[PDB]
């Protein structure tokens, strides 16, 4: 149907970070190049059928992030909201987890809430998720060295 949410997010490529336009509908989560000059979404780079999503949760953030992903001291500025992306969340599907970084806690919340809504009736929703990122061939949370490894932490 229509776009539920449209945001510019920093996403981690399949093992590099890219700044992309993300669109959510009841059918698809998709991502696009952003045409900054014309102020429009550019060419589609990927799509995930919502029915394939098994898990959407927050990700324990990086220990030593670059400035682009540093969490500011607590408490909308035009530059910061397209330059800084320190709040990460994970979308889990058949082809492993996708890591998306939001510029604000509120934007990440909006996305996690709307994604949990659109996936609510999916057949393969999981009871366990990975609180930490997959990095250098292993999950930091449980040291498991397979991306499709069952979640090491039970969802509350
Ligand atoms: O590396 C990536 C980033 C991405 C986003 C989406 Cl929505 C789908 C697939 C992929 N693969
Ligand atoms: Mg537009
Ligand atoms: Zn784990």
């Amino acid at each position: 149907a229509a776009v539920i949410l449209e945001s510019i997010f920093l996403k981690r490529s399949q093992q590099n970070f890219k700044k992309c336009l993300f669109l959510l509908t009841v059918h698809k989560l998709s991502y696009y190049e952003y045409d900054f000059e014309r102020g429009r979404r550019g060419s589609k780079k990927g799509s995930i059928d919502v029915e394939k999503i098994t898990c959407v949760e927050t990700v324990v953030p990086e220990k030593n992030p670059p400035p682009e992903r540093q969490i500011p001291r607590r408490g909308m500025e035009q530059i910061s909201i397209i330059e800084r992306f320190p709040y990460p969340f994970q979308v889990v599907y058949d082809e492993g987890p996708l890591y998306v970084f939001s510029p604000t806690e509120e934007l990440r919340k909006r996305w996690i809430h709307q994604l949990k809504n659109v996936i609510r009736y999916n057949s393969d929703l999981v009871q366990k998720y990975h609180p930490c990122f997959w990095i250098d061939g292993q999950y930091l949370c449980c040291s498991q060295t397979a991306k499709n490894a069952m979640g090491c932490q039970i969802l509350e």
Side-chain angles (χ1 to χ4, degrees), residues 11-14 22 29 31 47-48 93 98:
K11 39 59 81 322
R12 211 186 80 174
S13 293
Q14 280 226 120
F22 277 81
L29 177 64
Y31 86 114
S47 230
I48 300 160
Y93 64 110
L98 158 76

Side-chain angles (χ1 to χ4, degrees), residues 49-144:
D49 298 320
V50 159
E51 71 175 51
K52 289 179 180 174
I53 308 183
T54 63
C55 187
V56 175
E57 295 294 342
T58 64
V59 186
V60 169
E62 289 161 287
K63 268 170 199 258
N64 300 115
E68 175 186 63
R69 298 189 304 274
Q70 292 177 354
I71 295 159
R73 86 190 164 189
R74 197 86 190 285
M76 171 163 311
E77 205 276 314
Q78 183 197 40
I79 303 302
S80 76
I81 201 156
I82 66 162
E83 283 191 3
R84 302 267 186 162
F85 304 87
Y87 309 101
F89 64 100
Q90 56 180 307
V91 178
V92 186
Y93 64 110
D94 201 19
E95 299 189 14
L98 158 76
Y99 298 110
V100 182
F101 295 75
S102 164
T104 69
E105 293 164 279
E106 193 272 359
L107 198 42
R108 174 173 69 175
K109 202 169 282 192
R110 280 206 248 158
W111 275 79
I112 291 169
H113 290 176
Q114 275 299 351
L115 281 162
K116 281 176 176 302
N117 185 50
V118 302
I119 72 178
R120 181 188 181 169
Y121 302 115
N122 285 6
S123 28
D124 314 321
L125 293 184
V126 299
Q127 291 164 252
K128 302 207 197 78
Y129 89 127
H130 284 268
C132 298
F133 288 103
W134 164 272
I135 281 188
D136 273 305
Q138 77 152 249
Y139 279 100
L140 296 173
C141 36
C142 66
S143 303
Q144 294 201 81

